[PDB]
Design an enzyme around this catalytic site. Structure first.
Site, PDB file in Angstrom:
ATOM      1  N   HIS A  48       4.141  25.301 -25.199  1.00  0.00           N
ATOM      2  CA  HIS A  48       2.848  24.914 -24.634  1.00  0.00           C
ATOM      3  C   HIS A  48       2.886  24.759 -23.115  1.00  0.00           C
ATOM      4  O   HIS A  48       1.826  24.662 -22.486  1.00  0.00           O
ATOM      5  CB  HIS A  48       2.224  23.692 -25.334  1.00  0.00           C
ATOM      6  CG  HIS A  48       2.772  22.364 -24.895  1.00  0.00           C
ATOM      7  ND1 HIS A  48       3.802  21.726 -25.591  1.00  0.00           N
ATOM      8  CD2 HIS A  48       2.395  21.577 -23.862  1.00  0.00           C
ATOM      9  CE1 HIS A  48       3.987  20.583 -24.968  1.00  0.00           C
ATOM     10  NE2 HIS A  48       3.169  20.452 -23.914  1.00  0.00           N
ATOM     11  N   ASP A  94       8.330  23.773 -30.976  1.00  0.00           N
ATOM     12  CA  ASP A  94       7.769  24.002 -29.650  1.00  0.00           C
ATOM     13  C   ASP A  94       8.876  24.252 -28.593  1.00  0.00           C
ATOM     14  O   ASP A  94       9.105  23.425 -27.696  1.00  0.00           O
ATOM     15  CB  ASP A  94       6.876  22.804 -29.292  1.00  0.00           C
ATOM     16  CG  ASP A  94       5.929  22.994 -28.139  1.00  0.00           C
ATOM     17  OD1 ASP A  94       5.827  24.143 -27.616  1.00  0.00           O
ATOM     18  OD2 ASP A  94       5.308  21.999 -27.712  1.00  0.00           O
ATOM     19  N   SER A 133       6.351  17.242 -21.015  1.00  0.00           N
ATOM     20  CA  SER A 133       6.585  18.361 -21.911  1.00  0.00           C
ATOM     21  C   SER A 133       7.727  19.235 -21.327  1.00  0.00           C
ATOM     22  O   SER A 133       7.735  19.587 -20.141  1.00  0.00           O
ATOM     23  CB  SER A 133       5.336  19.220 -21.985  1.00  0.00           C
ATOM     24  OG  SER A 133       4.338  18.443 -22.634  1.00  0.00           O
TER      25      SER A 133
END
Ligand code: NA
Length: 206
Positions: free
Chosen positions: A40, A78, A158
């Site tokens: 992402h 992810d 992230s």
């Protein structure tokens, strides 16, 4: 509270030399010319985009490098591998070679509920400044490819490495609960054998 969030003063010492910054999130070095982040995060970037090695809040860094390949894990986790061109587009203090300016982490033997971890990354993007933070807290659970921990994280985290007390890698951060309270879970990908193999396969061969 003993779960702390603090600014990292100097980013040119270990373990901070393993961390990289995208324009608005984090990654970390896994091998020769190779970085790990979240899918992402990498979805926002292309071949030719730049990453900065461990930038400090006073315009210092370990060089600026060009993305040459983005490899997304085909599984549900992810995870994205990014290879960079070896020679910096802005020299680092230890020269043009990416590998001379950064340090990859050793994998921990594993992780267990209750142990202390550290999430290192760039929680919030600023106009023309990078501010590295370290955030600590306990592991809550470890199951399959999931590691859950109670450490404060934000959007920019992230892709951050999650380290144990001895700076060994236990996971890669990808998400957090949006609750306001202090008893909030954050989520990382735990390095299972098939994820470790995917990463190893995709380290630049030179
Ligand atoms: Na981003």
């Amino acid at each position: 509270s003993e779960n702390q969030v603090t600014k990292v003063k100097d980013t040119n010492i270990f373990p901070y030399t393993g961390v990289v910054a995208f324009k608005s999130a984090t990654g970390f070095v896994v091998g020769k010319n190779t970085i790990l982040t979240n899918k992402h995060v990498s979805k926002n970037y292309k071949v030719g985009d730049r990453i900065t090695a461990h930038p400090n809040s006073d315009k210092g860094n370990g060089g600026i490098y060009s993305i040459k390949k983005i490899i997304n894990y085909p599984g549900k986790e992810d995870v994205s591998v990014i290879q960079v061109e070896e020679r910096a587009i802005e020299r680092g203090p230890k020269g043009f070679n990416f590998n001379d300016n950064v340090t990859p982490f050793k994998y921990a033997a594993g992780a267990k509920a209750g142990e202390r971890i550290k999430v290192i990354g760039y929680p919030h993007p600023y106009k023309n400044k990078y501010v590295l933070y370290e955030s600590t807290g306990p592991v809550m659970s470890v199951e399959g490819s999931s590691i859950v921990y109670s450490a404060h994280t934000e959007r920019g985290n992230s892709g951050s490495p999650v380290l144990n007390s001895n700076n060994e890698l236990v996971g890669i951060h990808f998400a957090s609960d949006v609750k306001n309270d202090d008893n909030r879970n954050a989520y990382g990908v735990y390095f299972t054998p098939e994820i470790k193999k995917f990463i190893a396969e995709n380290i630049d061969k030179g």
